[PDB]
Ligand binder design. Structure first.
Ligand SMILES: Nc1ncnc2c1ncn2[C@@H]1O[C@H](COP(=O)(O)OP(=O)(O)OP(O)(O)=S)[C@@H](O)[C@H]1O
Lengths: 152, 240, 54, 239, 230, 53
């Protein structure tokens, strides 16, 4: 519905810094309960990608504050839920994931050179699942090209 | 297009054309609708005078099967009369064998089996009728069922049988049907029947309204429509 | 060594079936996949239709 | 071919008859899908509803017909044949209970319904009731059963069962799914039923369209599920 | 475009609606049955269409009494009907005479029933050819009937697909004098000549008739026997 | 022969799931390379039948 992303994102703009790490998994069932809906065909889609943008603002926490992207098993667990609970027929809210995973390889392209190659290569083995589930539609397979380039 | 002769034979694609032709036989008949409220069921039939030869009070399609059940038939009239007699007989068997009023589900299922038994064999034709069945009970509420020429019998809140089957239920469903008592629904059915076909193809029609519910204390009878005269003083206000 | 009788036109259809079925995967020769795919595609299940009256 | 215009039930040349194999898609004019699954000490039926109208009810569109207190069934095909077949089934179960003193096993009922269909088929001048019937039930010393009855009178019965419109595809999934030897812990059964219909039709819809009938050897009574627990199972299989 | 229906003869030939039922029998599932010196062996060919079906529900080899076996090659929905008729009829004989009915008398009465359905003119014939056997009075028997009401007596025969090919193997392989096990061996040989490639403890279904009575073997002994019997 | 028009897009109505890919294999790919089928030695895919509605 066109109210859930509104309430969640717009009233939880504060809850990334003041919270340590809890509202990530405490917006996880919130993200799933909006992810099981597709009403306005761009409202739920764009607002869930804004909750994923707040998730990428917590990627600073997940790769910097806490252990170096060990919580990506929980991340691709909630994305496992969000990508196999409401199969979508490859549609209906799905193109929120293009910017989401291009933002993931954006984050990993800005995270790869300093620390190590561990969080980016765990991201590549997650997104191999996500995008061998996905298609050859937009640049995420060109992201596969540059990511097997990274594994080289 | 076949193979359309017997009611026993199938088609190369698997349906009986006799039953189809009987279904669209009722399509040419007069428009008859029905709707229930939260404490009753209201019938209404668009009935037409032939030219000037009728008597305004003959051959009323609103039948009355049991003390609390009546029909709202549309289609071939004499076949509906025979079917109404069969329904009276079945309610007679139930009243004689169990000592209380027939539940409308069981009555409708027996009648559906009877119609299906006339659709099965090759000696007989399918019925050319489609009718409505209303009831009311203190422990059951209001129940409105519906029987096609084939024999598929299940339940509705509102229905329509005739030409304007779609063209009535387009605006039947915009009624706030639960929160209304049936005394509103009387003029509602009046305005719905009055909307369809004022003068275009025919010259004149005439309204009958049947009426069952809690307000009749479990009885089923025609309204005193002349009492409160609710169609015309609102029908003339429904043209604008 | 298999029964379930397969005639010469049916044999050649199996071979071309399997060869096209591997080359459309951009391969060199079948690694025994498409032979058994040609069985479980070509037989082709005694029709469907009707499994009544046998 | 024909030729003979298949008007009555006779034998054509080479060598089949065409009336029953036209009756086999009188199911297909129903526009409906049914799936049965037997894994373990439970048994699950799943079947959708096609209600386009808001004026039409929802309780009396149920295809799951509780035949007796331990036997449920589901019907496809045209509705009148199905309901008449259902009252014959109820009548004959009651005849068993009168004659033999105990509750009828689900096998003899399928045999009797098939034999009635054969008598309607053997002698002409009656339409052979073009509907298909799937039965379920619990038996002592045998667990649960799932059976299918044909309009032709060919009963059989087995583990994973499907009939309707799209069930070449459903049986393709049930060959591709009942080949791994895992146990079936009742929510595996419910999950496989929901997801097999959800992969054949590919809709992934509300809990208010399908009907779920279960029977279990903990409550041998036939049982029809409510919207709440159907919703609970549907989000419980949502990963 | 004639014959049509069952009431009138052809210009010169025969009853085409019986000929078509015989053709529909010949288009059916194969079977084989062999009379040996001490017993009779029956064997059918029962393929499930999918991997879903169960092999414990429907049974092809079927006893009529405790000492009379009976298989078919055709349609089960008619098979069960005339099975039930033979059941009730044999029990009527055993009511009258207090003695188990001889197999010839079964074949007489079943042939009378099938003939009565071949009589005019609204009912169709059975699409079923039987293979009746039993061990009555020492000497075992083997009786084939047909949809036309006729009946025969065989030492070994077959019915279904490739009954001609199976019969040419039966004429070559079998003889008059064997025991029941060698009869089962040549029976599974002639069914394996013509059946599909996967023949297991469930695709076939074999019952025997000792002089000690009818016996319907289990998948246990079928799997023990057909564990590469040759 | 050459009254034959064309569509103003690949998606003139829709539903290009197997359409693009399998029509692409049945036409365009062995015309680009016959030697792949000459690992087997057969002519190009002998053509579907667009049936249905
Ligand atoms: N002995 C064989 N060895 C290899 N391939 C064979 C053999 N016999 C037949 N074939 C194959 O099967 C085909 C047989 O010729 P066909 O074209 O099938 O004859 P046909 O005209 O189609 O059948 P009819 O009865 O003449 S209409 C050959 O072209 C081969 O592909």
């Amino acid at each position: 519905m066109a109210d859930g992303g509104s309430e969640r994102a717009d009233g939880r703009i504060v809850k990334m810094e003041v919270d340590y790490s809890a509202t990530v998994d405490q917006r996880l069932p919130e993200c799933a309960k909006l992810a099981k809906e597709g009403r306005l065909q761009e409202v739920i889609e764009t607002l869930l990608s804004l909750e994923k943008q707040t998730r990428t603002a917590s990627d600073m926490v997940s790769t910097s504050r806490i252990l170096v992207a060990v919580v990506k098993m929980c991340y691709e667990a909630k994305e496992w839920d969000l990508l196999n609970e409401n199969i979508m027929l490859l549609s209906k809210r799905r193109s929120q994931l293009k910017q989401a995973v291009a933002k993931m390889v954006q984050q990993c392209c800005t995270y790869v050179e300093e620390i190590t190659d561990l969080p980016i290569k765990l991201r590549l083995i997650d997104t191999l699942r996500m995008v061998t589930e996905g298609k050859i539609y937009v640049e995420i397979e060109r992201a596969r090209l540059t990511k097997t380039l990274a594994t080289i | 297009t076949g193979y359309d002769l017997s009611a026993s034979t199938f088609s190369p694609d698997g349906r009986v054309f006799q039953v189809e032709y009987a279904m669209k036989a009722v399509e040419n008949s007069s428009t008859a609708i029905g709707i229930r409220c939260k404490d009753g069921v209201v019938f209404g039939v668009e009935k037409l005078v032939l030219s000037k030869l009728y008597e305004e009070g003959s051959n009323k399609r609103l039948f009355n099967v049991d003390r609390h059940v009546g029909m709202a038939v549309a289609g071939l009239l004499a076949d509906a009369r025979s079917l109404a007699d069969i329904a009276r007989e079945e309610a007679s068997n139930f009243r004689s064998n169990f000592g209380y009023n027939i539940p409308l589900k069981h009555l409708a299922d027996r009648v559906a089996m009877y119609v299906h038994a006339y659709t099965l064999y090759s000696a007989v034709r399918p019925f050319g009728c489609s009718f409505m069945l209303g009831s009311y009970s203190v422990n059951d509420g209001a129940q409105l069922y519906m029987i096609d020429p084939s024999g598929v019998s299940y339940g509705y809140w509102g229905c329509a049988i005739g030409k304007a089957r779609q063209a009535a239920k387009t605006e039947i469903e915009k009624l706030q049907m639960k929160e209304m008592t049936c005394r509103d629904i009387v003029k509602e059915v009046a305005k719905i029947i009055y909307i369809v076909h004022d003068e275009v193809k025919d010259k004149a029609f005439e309204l009958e309204l049947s009426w069952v519910g809690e307000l009749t204390n479990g009885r089923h009878e025609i309204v005193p429509k002349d009492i409160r005269e609710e169609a015309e003083k609102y029908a003339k206000e429904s043209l604008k | 060594a298999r029964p379930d009788k397969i005639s010469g036109a049916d044999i050649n259809s199996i071979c071309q079936e399997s060869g096209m079925l591997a080359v459309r995967e951009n391969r060199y020769i079948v690694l025994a996949k498409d032979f058994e795919k040609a069985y479980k595609t070509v037989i082709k299940k005694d029709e469907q239709e009707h499994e009544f009256y046998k | 071919s024909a030729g003979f215009d298949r008007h009555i039930t006779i034998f054509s040349p080479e060598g089949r008859l065409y009336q029953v194999e036209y009756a086999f898609k009188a199911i297909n004019q129903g526009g409906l899908t049914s799936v049965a699954v037997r894994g373990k000490d439970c048994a699950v039926i799943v079947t959708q509803k096609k209600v386009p109208d808001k004026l039409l009810d929802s309780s009396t569109v149920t295809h799951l017909f509780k035949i007796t207190e331990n036997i449920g069934c589901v019907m496809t095909g045209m509705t009148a044949d199905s309901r008449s077949q259902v009252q014959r089934a109820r009548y004959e179960a009651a005849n068993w209970k009168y004659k033999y003193g105990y509750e009828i096993p689900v096998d003899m009922l399928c045999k009797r319904i098939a034999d009635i269909s054969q008598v309607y088929t053997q002698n002409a001048e009656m339409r052979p009731l073009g509907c298909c019937m799937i039965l379920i039930g619990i038996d002592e010393e045998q667990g649960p059963q799932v059976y299918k009855c044909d309009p032709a009178g060919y009963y059989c019965g087995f583990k994973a069962t499907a009939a309707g419109v799209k069930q070449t595809e459903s049986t393709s999934f049930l060959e591709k799914k009942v080949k791994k030897k895992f146990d079936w812990t009742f929510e595996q059964t419910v999950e496989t039923a929901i997801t097999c219909l959800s992969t054949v039709l590919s809709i992934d819809f509300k809990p208010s369209e399908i009907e779920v009938g279960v029977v279990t050897v903990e409550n041998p009574k036939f049982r029809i599920l409510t919207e709440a627990e159907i919703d609970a199972h549907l989000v419980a299989l949502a990963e | 475009g004639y014959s049509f229906s069952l009431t009138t003869f052809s210009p010169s030939g025969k009853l085409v609606q019986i000929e078509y039922a015989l053709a529909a029998v010949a288009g059916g599932a194969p079977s084989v049955g062999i009379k040996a010196a001490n017993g009779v062996v029956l064997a059918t060919e029962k393929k499930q269409k999918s991997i879903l079906y169960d092999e414990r529900s429907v049974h092809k080899v079927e006893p009529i009494t405790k000492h009379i076996g009976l298989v078919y090659s055709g349609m089960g929905p008619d098979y069960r009907v005339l099975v039930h008729r033979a059941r009730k009829l044999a029990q009527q004989y055993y009511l009258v005479y207090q003695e188990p009915i001889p197999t010839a008398q079964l074949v007489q009465r079943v042939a009378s029933v099938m003939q009565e359905y071949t009589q005019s003119g609204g009912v169709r014939p059975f699409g079923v050819s039987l293979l009746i056997c039993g061990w009555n009075e020492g000497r075992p028997y083997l009786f084939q009937s047909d949809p036309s009401g006729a009946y025969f007596a065989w030492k070994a025969t077959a019915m279904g697909k490739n009954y001609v090919n199976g019969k040419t193997f039966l004429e070559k392989r079998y003889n008059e004098d064997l025991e029941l096990e060698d009869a089962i061996h040549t029976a599974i040989l002639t069914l394996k000549e013509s059946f599909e490639g996967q023949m297991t403890e469930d695709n076939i279904e074999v019952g025997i008739c000792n002089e000690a009575g009818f016996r319907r073997l289990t998948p246990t002994e079928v799997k023990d026997y057909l564990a590469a019997i040759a | 022969s050459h009254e034959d028009p064309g569509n103003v897009s690949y998606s003139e109505i829709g539903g290009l799931s197997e359409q693009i890919r399998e029509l692409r294999e049945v036409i365009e790919l062995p015309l680009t390379n016959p030697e792949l089928f000459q690992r087997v030695g057969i002519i190009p895919p002998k053509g579907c039948l667009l049936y249905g509605p």
